Amino acid sequence: ELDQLRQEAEQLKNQIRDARKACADATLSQITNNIDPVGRIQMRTRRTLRGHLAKIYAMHWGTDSRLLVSASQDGKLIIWDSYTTNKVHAIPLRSSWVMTCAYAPSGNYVACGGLDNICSIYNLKTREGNVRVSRELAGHTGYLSCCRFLDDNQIVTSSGDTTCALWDIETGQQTTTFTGHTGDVMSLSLAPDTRLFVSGACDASAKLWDVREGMCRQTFTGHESDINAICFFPNGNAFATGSDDATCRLFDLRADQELMTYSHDNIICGITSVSFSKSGRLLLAGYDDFNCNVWDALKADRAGVLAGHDNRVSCLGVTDDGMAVATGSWDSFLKIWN
Amino acid sequence: LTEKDKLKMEVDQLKKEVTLERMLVSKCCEEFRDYVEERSGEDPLVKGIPEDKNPFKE
Amino acid sequence: TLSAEDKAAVERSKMIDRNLREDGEKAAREVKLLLLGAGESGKSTIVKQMKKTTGIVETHFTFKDLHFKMFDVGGQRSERKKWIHCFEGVTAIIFCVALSDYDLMNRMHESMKLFDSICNNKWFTDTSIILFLNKKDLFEEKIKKSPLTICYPEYAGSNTYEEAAAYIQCQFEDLNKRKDTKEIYTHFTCATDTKNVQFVFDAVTDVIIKNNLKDCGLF
Amino acid sequence: DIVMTQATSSVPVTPGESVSISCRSSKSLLHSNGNTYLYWFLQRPGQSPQLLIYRMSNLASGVPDRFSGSGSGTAFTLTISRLEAEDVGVYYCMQHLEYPLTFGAGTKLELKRADAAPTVSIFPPSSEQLTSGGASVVCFLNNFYPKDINVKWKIDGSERQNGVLNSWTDQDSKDSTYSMSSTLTLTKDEYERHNSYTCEATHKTSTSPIVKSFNRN
Amino acid sequence: DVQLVESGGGLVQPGGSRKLSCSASGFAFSSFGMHWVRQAPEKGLEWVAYISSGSGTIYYADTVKGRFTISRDDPKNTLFLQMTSLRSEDTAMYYCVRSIYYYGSSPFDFWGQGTTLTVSSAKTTPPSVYPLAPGCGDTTGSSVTLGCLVKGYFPESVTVTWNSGSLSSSVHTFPALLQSGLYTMSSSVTVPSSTWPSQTVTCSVAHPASSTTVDKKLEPS
Amino acid sequence: QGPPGDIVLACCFAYIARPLPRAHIKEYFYTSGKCSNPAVVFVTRKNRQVCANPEKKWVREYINSLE
Amino acid sequence: TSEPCQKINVKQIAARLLPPLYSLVFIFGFVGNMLVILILINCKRLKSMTDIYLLNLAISDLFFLLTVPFWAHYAAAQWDFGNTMCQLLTGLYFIGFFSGIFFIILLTIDRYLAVVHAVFALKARTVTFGVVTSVITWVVAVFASLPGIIFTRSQKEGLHYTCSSHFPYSQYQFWKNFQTLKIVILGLVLPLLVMVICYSGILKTLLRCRNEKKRHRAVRLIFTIMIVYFLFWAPYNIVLLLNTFQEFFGLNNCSSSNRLDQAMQVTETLGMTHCCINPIIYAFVGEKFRNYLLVFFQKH
């Protein structure tokens, strides 16, 4: 009977692949052949933030595109003012094994977690003047791979036990659980409206979830190995995934299939972070070969390279207004490029 | 059980996914191209950014 | 050029910077050990000998004027490939292994495979291992009862504690391909005296001496 | 230094109505970094000040939303959309662009009420004071509005001006009325040299001032 | 709750010295820069002193530079202003203010309750109390006003009550004024004409500085 | 001891007996401090270099006059 | 009727020979010192005492070697700068010379502290202590240099120019002994006294080590350091001890005085070589610095 279920699943997969092939009449690259190349993009480092004493594992831009939080497993959450390079806050964490950080859209809270299996929320605007942890959300059983704020009271966290979760910060309990992944979840990406989000896991599949009802809508396959990063296209109808196969794949929610692959035989290192520009014409891919790359999303040819780091680019982000791109590496230096 | 329920949920998800209606890749790619073209000209990281209006200056 | 309210911000930035620099200076004097094992490998026994939160558990203590911070990954139940690289800078890797599990695909072979995987690693090409061999008191009666060859088909020798233990030790220590850039210490940890902590102290002293030599340039 | 100028006082306004308080600086407070450094503080009767606005547009925590700040580089305004009985007090503008921090003169927001004529009572020197060589004649003008008022002293019909000490009570927190005191002091013999004494209050509630007099017999 | 309690105020002769203390509780005292701001009697505010966080920077107002020293004991959560060569112009209420400076902070967000400092050479003197009853020919209306005059007292701290605080709805206390180097005020109570002289009306005047308490019973003329 | 270079100059080995005609004397200089004995060398119209004892009374007087 | 023994028979040939060797030893040491300074400042900086001690030693050697070319030109033709620069160059030369030795001693003490005492030195190896010690040793070096400086003057005689040091006559015979008693005790006796103890402890600790290849290489390097230092600072200092007491050994002859001067030139050249090789000995030894140099060279 189990063999019967497996056979039915395989037949369903075959039917789905056949349907996708029937719907894959063309690809993005050909229809954009008449668009002139963006040219050689040569960004320069306008700032360098040097306060961390260990590897940088997460950074997140503020909604005002000036302040940014960054987490390092020296045990510190440092909030930088990128305009003036001043350290606004330096929160000491209870567990130094931080793997993720979040800056609330309102700017009032930050969140971080990691191998401690707990997501801690820090209140930045307490009257006492000292940042203090307001809630320790403990309902996971694995490392907190990522976390993101829906608002000042809702947070989504994807963990290493293969389940994502939606929390109620005030009550400290788990509001909803998102199950359906087979391998560890490595990233999260809220949609522009924050109604639905995509999570990438080690199964090489990115799953679409609707926050309110807590179901899974779609599964996107096409990667040959794990997915390290996932970014939502600003339009909110597509998202780009970076994988260990040195390939960045563009996926569409409506078509439910891959639109483009950004790779060339020269580069054989896995991705670590992916992010789009404000207009979506550029895809910024942080690599483990120490060199960030800038892909012309409409042409797939390398628009440029960002080589200013001496270790893995662990995190990459773009200001909400698209003015600058912050890259944080394992050498403890953030660099703002523009 | 765990494996049996795992297979059941996988089959259910596959059913739900196969009920989906998929739009042609051509139209989606055209929409992507048009959306990027409408806004590429004003993207700071694509077009040259003069220093005087650059928030990051020395 | 700076507003009267911006110099205060710069002063706060500098004060935070000099606070976190001294915090890192303090952290640089901590001996970070990573505890590893499998099943009932006696890791609880090692913690007891030394002496709410799922995942990594940190235990800090001081012995003979040195501060140890033992990180027991414990029940992570996750792909180690995605969270082991954060321990690249650890000082030493304590590795507990049961010797009464030679009877029980085998538990000894599982431990051996885990040891090989975590010893020959992209990130632990220099960190020294400290292998603990637990439960020798019980393994004594177990080897008196049944032969060890049931676990090692190639084993050739007598069915005695000293030789069985020597063979197990040699089999574990032969798994490291890079014998020149990292050493594998060993101690039959069932010893209930303070030797259990003394051996770790000696191994960490040797490792830090080697690191200091490498920095100075002698090595 | 930077000189901050305000009006000495603002027109009293009724609760529920909007009100504006202006301040101005001798130099532009708009720094090159975009921040205009100006803080608006409130000091209520018998209490310590408290921040209302910081950097000219930001409402401090715990401040009701009705308070708002605005203004150009060298002219600033604090607007209360709907006044309350709890907004009475002094409003100060302060500049933080350069040290030293120079406050403003302070605008004293006070309530408005229906005009009421003063109740005037005259009191002669007590026998106790008369035995000590002094003689104080006292004129109490209770429960009148507005603040401005005049008091005149006469002795047997002859005006006197010097030797009068005048005191205004702060506006009553319950009925919003003012109460006034005029004290006219003499040596014992000088006071005893005359028989009748009088104080007249000239107040806007009556064209003819209200008279209160007493004869020493 | 955030609290800044000041102490050390009182009476000081001109040319003397005095230390004002500010005890901080309920917040991280060491993260905040501190200010001392003075308010002269019946006048506006004037910035006096500023000490940064960690004592890394200090500023003084020109009117006080060289005479006042600002310091902070973080372990005890205390702020000190030591004043030397006090002048007559230095009499005022001194307020302790906290101020944290970074991107988006709100400086000057809390002020203490203030401490009163009186720099004057006047000698402590008890008050002189005089009753104030209607004149002999005074007309008896529906309500009658009685009062008490307080003259020639120093320092400026006297409390007047009527019938041990029972009469407070119609009680008025007039602000003190300087006369002949001392202080003077008056106080009034209006009561129904049927209650006086039927019921005794007494005013109690307390001068804590001289530790004096005088009760005067109003008597009809 | 001393700095690098060729820094090798003629050293003095003997002292003059009595003063020579002071008129013909042009200049004077000291020898390198490395040499064994102290001495002041005078150059005359015949360019003759003659030693002297700086601790001597008349040599000291001549040095004082010429300085 | 004669004059002091004319030192021209070998003096001219010596002054002709010297400037080529001074240019060669100047370029060979300047390249090493500049590479060391650039790599350390750009790549890895001030994490422990050793890092800043090596930087300070490199800075001292850079000064000493920047000063050498001026004296290299001195050999060619004559001295053509002036008295103020004659004093300044000697001062900078001695400053670098003494600072290099002091920082060698500091590095040798740091190695002993790091190796022999590991638990104890785990907390004492802080950058603050290193920097305060560096400034203190700079202050000590300037103190030992000033006595040499204040007696240096440029003599403009008719025949030629001189840029040497002339001691006060009344105390002339005294100070030179001091001038020598300061360049041997700070040159060999104290450096070797510290080195013997430090490296004896280091070797005793190394024997306890287990490896059979890197330990042998380390012992080879230790003994190479000791013997090369002694070899390159024994000849000059010994000939100085001879010269300051030239007559006590019965060398009262022109021939013996010329032998001393020729040996002085030859043995000085060795010392210049010693600043030129010292950075190589203390940095280019199988160290992580080798890989840093490789990678940073690949970056440019």
Side-chain angles (χ1 to χ4, degrees), chain C residues 3 24 38 76 111 212:
Chain C
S3 75
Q76 193 69 34
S111 303
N212 283 330

Side-chain angles (χ1 to χ4, degrees), chain D:
Chain D
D1 291 331
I2 297 90
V3 181
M4 318 291 316
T5 318
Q6 314 182 231
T8 188
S9 178
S10 66
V11 175
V13 298
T14 71
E17 171 76 280
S18 164
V19 60
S20 282
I21 322 174
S22 160
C23 169
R24 63 189 42 263
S25 185
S26 63
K27 173 171 44 46
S28 165
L29 297 183
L30 178 46
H31 195 277
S32 178
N33 60 21
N35 297 326
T36 306
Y37 297 95
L38 187 143
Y39 298 169
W40 281 98
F41 299 95
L42 178 61
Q43 176 169 35
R44 306 185 165 115
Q47 267 188 276
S48 64
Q50 51 184 129
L51 180 70
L52 296 185
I53 301 283
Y54 61 84
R55 284 188 294 280
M56 196 202 67
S57 57
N58 313 310
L59 204 64
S61 196
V63 175
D65 183 10
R66 53 176 184 272
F67 294 100
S68 296
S70 76
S72 62
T74 186
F76 307 93
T77 304
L78 179 83
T79 294
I80 302 93
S81 295
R82 64 201 151 271
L83 191 64
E84 306 217 347
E86 298 67 70
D87 281 5
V88 300
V90 189
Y91 294 82
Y92 296 108
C93 65
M94 183 200 99
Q95 63 90 18
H96 207 316
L97 193 155
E98 291 136 0
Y99 274 86
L101 322 184
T102 45
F103 287 77
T107 298
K108 194 217 184 279
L109 200 79
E110 65 183 1
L111 292 193
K112 194 146 60 52
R113 64 151 281 131
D115 289 359
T119 77
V120 184
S121 177
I122 208 164
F123 294 122
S126 59
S127 52
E128 286 121 308
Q129 186 179 22
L130 291 169
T131 60
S132 284
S136 299
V137 186
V138 183
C139 183
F140 283 10
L141 283 71
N142 297 47
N143 299 105
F144 63 84
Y145 186 95
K147 184 142 161 293
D148 73 309
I149 192 158
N150 292 115
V151 182
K152 278 222 181 194
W153 282 101
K154 294 142 61 73
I155 62 173
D156 283 338
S158 179
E159 170 186 341
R160 294 179 67 188
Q161 326 86 39
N162 55 76
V164 292
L165 287 182
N166 64 7
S167 51
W168 301 280
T169 303
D170 183 1
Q171 199 194 152
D172 270 27
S173 54
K174 301 296 187 291
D175 62 358
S176 178
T177 67
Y178 295 86
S179 298
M180 186 66 204
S181 194
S182 189
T183 61
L184 189 152
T185 297
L186 280 68
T187 66
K188 182 172 73 176
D189 198 337
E190 182 65 26
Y191 169 77
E192 292 178 351
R193 288 208 300 174
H194 276 227
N195 204 27
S196 183
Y197 264 50
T198 298
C199 74
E200 293 83 3
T202 302
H203 195 55
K204 188 259 284 183
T205 315
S206 188
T207 68
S208 66
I210 190 167
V211 186
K212 284 304 310 212
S213 180
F214 76 88
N215 84 319
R216 199 172 41 95
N217 296 327

Side-chain angles (χ1 to χ4, degrees), chain A residues 114-325:
Chain A
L115 308 189
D116 50 341
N117 295 356
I118 299 175
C119 188
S120 291
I121 310 296
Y122 301 102
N123 196 0
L124 296 186
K125 318 201 151 172
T126 181
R127 72 184 314 199
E128 277 94 2
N130 61 339
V131 182
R132 44 158 282 275
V133 67
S134 68
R135 263 281 162 200
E136 299 216 289
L137 311 174
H140 276 306
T141 53
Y143 57 89
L144 266 289
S145 68
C146 197
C147 67
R148 282 285 167 279
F149 274 86
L150 281 169
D151 67 348
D152 263 9
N153 206 74
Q154 293 194 300
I155 186 163
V156 300
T157 67
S158 69
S159 61
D161 68 310
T162 68
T163 79
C164 299
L166 182 63
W167 301 85
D168 180 49
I169 297 167
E170 201 296 328
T171 61
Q173 288 181 355
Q174 201 161 198
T175 300
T176 306
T177 310
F178 303 94
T179 59
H181 268 300
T182 64
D184 296 7
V185 191
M186 308 299 322
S187 63
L188 279 175
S189 177
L190 279 299
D193 70 358
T194 63
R195 274 320 320 281
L196 58 84
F197 66 92
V198 296
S199 53
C202 293
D203 194 311
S205 80
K207 274 182 179 213
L208 200 68
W209 311 88
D210 282 14
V211 181
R212 293 283 91 80
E213 61 275 20
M215 66 182 179
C216 179
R217 283 186 58 197
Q218 300 176 9
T219 305
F220 297 79
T221 64
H223 276 298
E224 291 146 310
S225 54
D226 298 350
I227 302 168
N228 302 12
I230 196 159
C231 181
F232 66 94
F233 190 73
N235 199 159
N237 268 333
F239 63 97
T241 45
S243 61
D244 282 357
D245 189 71
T247 46
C248 294
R249 291 187 145 79
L250 184 61
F251 296 130
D252 178 323
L253 308 190
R254 303 154 37 211
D256 200 270
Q257 65 180 303
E258 181 193 79
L259 277 67
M260 265 302 307
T261 62
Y262 311 113
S263 60
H264 61 316
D265 60 358
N266 305 336
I267 191 166
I268 62 170
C269 64
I271 318 303
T272 310
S273 303
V274 183
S275 296
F276 280 89
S277 65
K278 186 179 69 61
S279 77
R281 177 59 185 268
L282 292 195
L283 182 53
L284 314 184
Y287 290 81
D288 303 336
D289 67 356
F290 293 166
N291 288 310
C292 174
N293 210 348
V294 176
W295 295 99
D296 188 8
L298 296 186
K299 307 304 291 276
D301 189 358
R302 288 168 297 171
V305 65
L306 277 50
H309 285 283
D310 50 310
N311 217 353
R312 286 190 182 179
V313 302
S314 179
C315 48
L316 183 150
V318 177
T319 51
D320 291 331
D321 53 48
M323 219 72 61
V325 58

